[PDB]
Amino acid sequence: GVTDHTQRLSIITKDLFQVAFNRVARGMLHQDHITFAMLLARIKLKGTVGEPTYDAEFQHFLRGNEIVLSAGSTPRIQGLTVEQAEAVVRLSCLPAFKDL
């Protein structure tokens, strides 16, 4: 029914990710559906127009444990558990969360 080339291309692009997930996740364990959907979302975010790369934010999301904090360097925050405060100080290395 749709004839315009741009609309058809957009429909194809959406259905590519949708059908890829439908075909693959039917063959994965339910715990691994979210991983593949996350990867597909990251692929679409890479391919989309008008959105930043978010390479630093995703890089942190993956390996923020690599951010080293010295023993005692992490301050104690009221109402926050020690591991929570550790994660907070690790997240504060990003410029967006400097005043976290």
| Contact partners, residue 54, CB within 8 Å, separation at least 6 | 45
Distance CA 24, CA 36 (A): 9
Is the CB of residue 90 less than 8 Å from the CB of residue 69? yes
Q: What radius of gyration, in Å, describes the C-alpha atoms of the chain?
A: 20
Distance CA 44, CA 87 (A): 28
| Contact partners, residue 88, CB within 8 Å, separation at least 6 | 77, 80, 100
Q: Which approach determined this entry?
A: cryo-EM
Distance CA 64, CA 93 (A): 10
Q: What's this structure's resolution in Å?
A: 2.9
Determine whether 74 is exposed, middle or buried from the number of CB atoms within 10 Å of its CB (0-12, 13-18, 19+).
Answer: middle
